[PDB]
Write a protein that binds this ligand. Structure first.
Ligand SMILES: Nc1c2c(nc3cc(Cl)ccc13)C[C@H]1C=C(CCCCn3cc(CO)nn3)C[C@@H]2C1
Ligand SMILES: Nc1c2c(nc3cc(Cl)ccc13)C[C@H]1C=C(CCCCn3cc(CO)nn3)C[C@@H]2C1
Ligand SMILES: CC(=O)N[C@@H]1[C@@H](O)[C@H](O)[C@@H](CO)O[C@H]1O
Ligand SMILES: [Cl-]
Ligand SMILES: [Cl-]
Ligand SMILES: [Cl-]
Lengths: 540, 540
C-alpha cells in the first residue's frame, strides 16, 4: 500500500490512483462522493451531505455523469464528440475530483476549483479538456472539480415549494465548495486560498457564488471565462420558471388528468417519471425558436439570489474581490451552426441577407420588430448590405456579443466601479489541431485546453509554441489564484496586464505573440447592447 | 446705346450695362421686373405677371431686397455681414438679373438659374457672392437670378384659403422660370437648356421644382447644394402652417382684438400691418427650442406639393433628369454658434458632456427622450465619452447630418433608384480668406464663392491655387449645365467623376487636390437618420 495514495476525509478513507503527467507524477482522487445520491424522493431537492462510510472507498476513476441531454448534431465527429459524456449517465452523480502533486505538497498550496459549463443542461467534470494533472504537476496546484445536477434535475423549479425549490444545481456546487473548506487540507490544499473558475454556465455559476451570500466565504478569488450571471441566458424569473416546470410536467404524466391543486402532488408525480422522459421533453418548453437559450437555468427566487444579477452587480459592495474575466475571439460561431439556417461546418456559410435577418430573430428571440431592426442597423454594412462574408461574420458577432462579450464587459465595468480589482482578456489563439472550419475562428470553449495545459502531453501533437503558450496561461491563472494578480511577481519585461477600469478600459490579447494591452472591449457595440437596447425592448 | 445693351422682351424694352470682369467685359441687365409688385392687397397672394411697359426700362442696377429679418449675431463682423441685404428692404422686390458675355453670344447659350438660400426667411440675388459676371465672362454662361418673397411674405399660409394659399415664394420663383422661357433667347440664352442651381433653401426650392409638374416643364437639369426638399426643415404640414399663421396674427393684434374669424378677415387684418411688424414677429411662432427650424417655409398644400417631398421622391419617374448634389465638410458648425449653448466664434468651443446632451435636444427638437438617446448612442465615443474636442465635433455632425448630409444622401439614392443620372460631391476646401475660426471647418454656404468664381478677381486676395480651383469648379458646373455630365468631354485622365448609384454610392471630393472618388456618403450614419430614427420617433 502506497501511503501517498491514501487519504482520510471527514466521511472516511479514500484510495487515489498515481498518475503519470509528462513531467513526473501526481495523485488523483476521482469520484469522491460529496452528497447523498439525489435520487428517488430526493429528486429536485437541495443536496444532502454524504453520510460517512466505513472501509476504504475506491477513488481511482471518474464517477457517473449527471443525467442529461446529449447533442446529436454531427454524429461521429471529434469536434462535437469531445464534449459528450464519457461515463454512464445517472441521477447518482454528485461526485468531485481532486488532483495534488506527487508527493503531497510542502505547505498549504492554493486551490483551483473548476465548474464546467454547458448551458446548464449538459457537462461533466470527467472530460479530457478538464483534466487537472498539468496544473497540479507543472504549477504545484491542488485542482478540484465537481459534478452538479443539470437540466430539470438541477433547475426545474416550482418557486416557493419545499419540494422543487429551484437552483439545486448551484446548491450542489455550494456543497462541493463546503467540502473543500472541510477537507482540502488533507490533500495539501489551502482552505484560505480558494479560486473558482469556469467556462460558459460554469462562469455564470462562479458569478452566482460571487452574488449569493452563503457562498462568499467559501472562496477568495474568481475567474469567469466566456459567461456571466447577468445577461440574457443565465437566469429566468420565478414566473417563467413556473411556466416551464408546469408545462414540462403536463407533457409527461403530471399531475394526472388536469388536476392543478397541490404543487407537492405535482412534484410527487414527476418523481415517478423515468429520467429519460424528462430529458425527452426539456426543449419543448422554450417560449420561441431561439439559440443560446436554455430551458432550466438558475431562477431569481428571492433566495439563492436575492434580486436579479443586473440589480446585484449595480448595488454590490465588492472591495475585497479580485476577478479575472474574458472571452474567446469568436463566441458566436458554434451557436450559428447549431441552430441558425445557412450555417454548417461542411460548407463555409456565406449566407443571403434574408438568412441574416431571420438569424437575428433567432439570435434575439426577445426582440420586437423595432429592436430586431436596431440590431440589423448596427450590424449591417450599409455600403455592402449583401456581402455574404460580412453577413456571416456579422451574424456570428450578433450572437456572441449579445450572449457573451457585452455581458462580460457589463460585468467587468460594474465590478470595477464597485471596488473590485478586475483583469480582462480576449483569447485569440486558434489551435493547430482544431477540426472546425477556419470560418469559425476560435469558437466557444476552445481556450479551455490551453488553460488546462493539454498542449504539454506531447502525444497530442500540439506545436512547440502552443506548448509555451499553454505554460504562460497556466502561470497567469495560477499566479492569479495565489495573489489576485496574474502578473509575474518579479518579472523583467513581459509586459504588465493592467487592471480593467471604467476610466481606461484595458484588457489584454492572449495569443502566440507577447501580451498586448488594448482599450475598450467592443465599447460602441456594448453601449448598444447594455444601455440602449434594453430601453428599446421594454417600451416596444 | 450698344445694340449689345439694349433688349426687347415681351413686356417692353430694357437697357443693361457693360461691366468689367477680370478677363474682359460682360453685359448685365439688373432689376428686371418679372411680376406686378406684390404689395397692398396682393400681400400673401400668388404673383401676377408684370404688366407691359413703354419706354426703355433702365436695367442697370440691382433692385430692392424682399422684406426680411436681418441677422445680428455678430454686429460688425465681416463673416456674418457678407450675407445681409445690400439694398433697401421693400415689398416691391420681384426683380431678376441676367448676365451674358459681351457682345451677347452668337449661339444659344445654356442658361444657369440661381436661387439663393437663407432658410426661407432671408437672402437676395444681389449679394456679392452671387455675382454672375465670372461665369458669364469665363465660361460664356447666361446666368439669371431672381428675388423671391421670403418669411411671412413668401410663406405665411392659411391652407385652403384664397387670400393666403401658401408657397407664394415658390410661385415667385416659378414665374421667373417662365420669364426665362419666354425671354432668354433675346439675351442669347438657350431656353432648350436651362439648369437650376441653388444652395441651402435655394437647393430645397430647386428640389421642389423637380417635384411640381408645372415647374418641371421649364427646365432640364438641377443642382442642389446643401439643401433638399425632403428632410426636417424644408416643409411644414398644412396644420402646422395654419397654427403658425394664426398665432402670428394673434401676436400682432389680428383677430382684430376678439376671436379667430374667417380666413378672409384675419388676412385682411394682417394686410393692414406694416411690413416690419410682421418681420418683427416671425420667430415668435416656433413651437420648440430649436436650431435649423424656420417659421414660414413651403407648406404641403396638395397643390404646389401634391404630397410630402418624401412621398414624391419615393414614387416619381425621374428618367429624364440629371441632378448634381452635394454638401460642404462642416454643415452644422454655424448652426451651433447661432443657437446651441457652448459654441462661439471667439474660442475653440470645447464642450462638456452635459452640453452635448442639451445640444442634441435643440438639434433634434422632435426627438422623444429615447430617440434622443439613440442619437447620443450613435455619436458618443464610448471609450472617451467626455473628450471635449470629440463632443464639439459630434455636436456639429449631429446637426449637419440630420439637416443636410443625410437628407442629401436620401435624395441621391431615391433619385438614382427611380432613374435619374446623379452626381454627388463633398466640398472640402476652406477659403484662405475665411474669418470664422478653424474649428468651424468649411461652414454652410462657403463653397458658393468658389462656384461663382470670386477667386478670379485678384483684388479679393485668394491664393493662386484658389483661382485654379475656382476655374475647375466653374467648368464642372458649366459642363453639367451644358450636357448633364460635369466631366470634361474632350479630355481624359482627370480623373473622372462617376455617377452616384445605389449599388456603388460613388461621390467625389472637391478640394485643391485632384478629384478623389469616395464610396458611401456617411453610409452608416445615414441609414441611422433615414431609416431607423423615423420608426423610433414615431414609435415613441
Ligand atoms: N459542446 C460544446 C461545449 C462548449 N463549446 C463547444 C464548441 C463547439 Cl465548436 C462545439 C461544441 C461545444 C463549451 C461549453 C458550453 C456548452 C454549451 C453549448 C450550447 C449549445 N446550444 C444549445 C442551444 C439551445 O438552442 N443553444 N446553444 C457545451 C460545451 C461546454
Ligand atoms: N447667413 C449665412 C448664410 C449661409 N451661411 C452662413 C454661414 C455662416 Cl458661418 C454665417 C452666416 C451664414 C448660407 C445661406 C443659408 C442661410 C440660412 C441660415 C440659417 C441660420 N439659422 C437660424 C436658425 C433659427 O433657429 N436656425 N438656423 C443664411 C445665409 C445663406
Ligand atoms: C401529509 C401532508 O402533510 N400533506 C398531504 C397533501 O399534500 C396531499 O395532497 C394529500 C395526500 O396525497 O393529503 C396529505
Ligand atoms: Cl486598440
Ligand atoms: Cl462693378
Ligand atoms: Cl455694392
Amino acid at each position: 500500500e502506497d501511503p501517498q495514495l491514501l487519504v482520510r476525509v471527514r466521511g472516511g478513507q479514500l484510495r487515489g490512483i498515481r498518475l503519470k503527467a509528462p513531467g513526473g507524477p501526481v495523485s488523483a482522487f476521482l469520484g469522491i462522493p460529496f452528497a447523498e445520491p439525489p435520487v428517488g424522493s430526493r429528486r429536485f431537492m437541495p443536496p444532502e451531505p454524504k453520510r460517512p462510510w466505513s472501509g476504504v472507498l475506491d477513488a481511482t476513476t471518474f464517477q457517473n455523469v449527471c443525467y442529461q441531454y446529449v447533442d446529436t448534431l454531427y454524429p461521429g465527429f471529434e469536434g462535437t464528440e469531445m464534449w459528450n459524456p464519457n461515463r454512464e449517465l445517472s441521477e447518482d452523480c454528485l461526485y468531485l475530483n481532486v488532483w495534488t502533486p506527487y508527493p503531497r505538497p510542502a505547505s498549504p498550496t492554493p486551490v483551483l476549483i473548476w465548474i464546467y459549463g454547458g448551458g446548464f443542461y449538459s457537462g461533466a467534470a470527467s472530460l479530457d479538456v478538464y483534466d487537472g494533472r498539468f496544473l497540479a504537476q507543472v504549477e504545484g496546484a491542488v485542482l478540484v472539480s465537481m459534478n452538479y445536477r443539470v437540466g430539470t434535475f438541477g433547475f426545474l423549479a416550482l418557486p416557493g415549494s419545499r419540494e422543487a425549490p429551484g437552483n439545486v444545481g448551484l446548491l450542489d456546487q455550494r456543497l462541493a465548495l463546503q467540502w473543500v473548506q472541510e477537507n482540502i487540507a488533507a490533500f495539501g490544499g489551502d482552505p484560505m486560498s480558494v479560486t473558482l473558475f469556469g467556462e460558459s454556465a460554469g462562469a455564470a455559476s462562479v458569478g452566482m457564488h460571487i452574488l449569493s451570500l452563503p457562498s462568499r466565504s467559501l472562496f477568495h478569488r474568481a475567474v469567469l471565462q466566456s459567461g456571466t450571471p447577468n445577461g440574457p441566458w443565465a437566469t429566468v424569473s420565478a414566473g417563467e420558471a413556473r411556466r416551464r416546470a408546469t408545462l414540462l410536467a403536463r407533457l409527461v404524466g403530471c399531475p394526472p388528468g388536469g388536476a392543478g391543486g397541490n404543487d407537492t402532488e405535482l412534484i410527487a408525480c414527476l418523481r415517478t417519471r423515468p429520467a429519460q422522459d424528462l430529458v425527452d421533453h426539456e426543449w419543448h418548453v422554450l417560449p420561441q425558436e431561439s439559440i443560446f437559450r436554455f430551458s432550466f437555468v438558475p431562477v431569481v427566487d428571492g433566495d439563492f439570489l436575492s434580486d436579479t444579477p443586473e440589480a446585484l452587480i449595480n448595488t454590490g459592495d465588492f472591495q475585497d474581490l479580485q476577478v479575472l474575466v474574458g472571452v474567446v475571439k469568436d463566441e458566436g460561431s458554434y451557436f450559428l451552426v447549431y441552430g441558425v439556417p445557412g450555417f454548417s461546418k461542411d460548407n463555409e456559410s456565406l449566407i443571403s441577407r434574408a438568412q441574416f435577418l431571420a438569424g437575428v430573430r433567432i439570435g434575439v428571440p426577445q426582440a420586437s420588430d423595432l429592436a430586431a431592426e436596431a440590431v440589423v442597423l448596427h450590424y449591417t454594412d450599409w455600403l455592402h448590405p449583401e456581402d455574404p462574408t460580412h453577413l456571416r461574420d456579422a451574424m456570428s458577432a450578433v450572437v456572441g456579443d449579445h450572449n457573451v462579450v457585452c455581458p462580460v464587459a457589463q460585468l467587468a465595468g460594474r465590478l470595477a466601479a464597485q471596488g473590485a480589482r478586475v483583469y480582462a482578456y480576449i483569447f485569440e489563439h486558434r489551435a493547430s489541431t482544431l477540426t472546425w472550419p477556419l470560418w469559425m475562428g476560435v469558437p466557444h470553449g476552445y481556450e479551455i485546453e490551453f488553460i488546462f495545459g493539454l498542449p504539454l502531453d506531447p502525444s497530442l501533437n500540439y506545436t512547440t509554441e502552443e506548448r509555451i503558450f499553454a505554460q504562460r496561461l497556466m502561470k497567469y491563472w495560477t499566479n492569479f489564484a495565489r495573489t489576485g494578480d496574474p502578473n509575474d511577481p518579479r518579472d523583467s519585461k513581459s509586459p504588465q496586464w493592467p487592471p480593467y477600469t471604467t476610466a481606461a478600459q484595458q484588457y489584454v490579447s492572449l495569443n502566440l505573440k507577447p501580451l498586448e494591452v488594448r482599450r475598450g472591449l467592443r465599447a460602441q457595440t456594448c453601449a448598444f447592447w447594455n444601455r440602449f437596447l434594453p430601453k428599446l425592448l421594454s417600451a416596444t
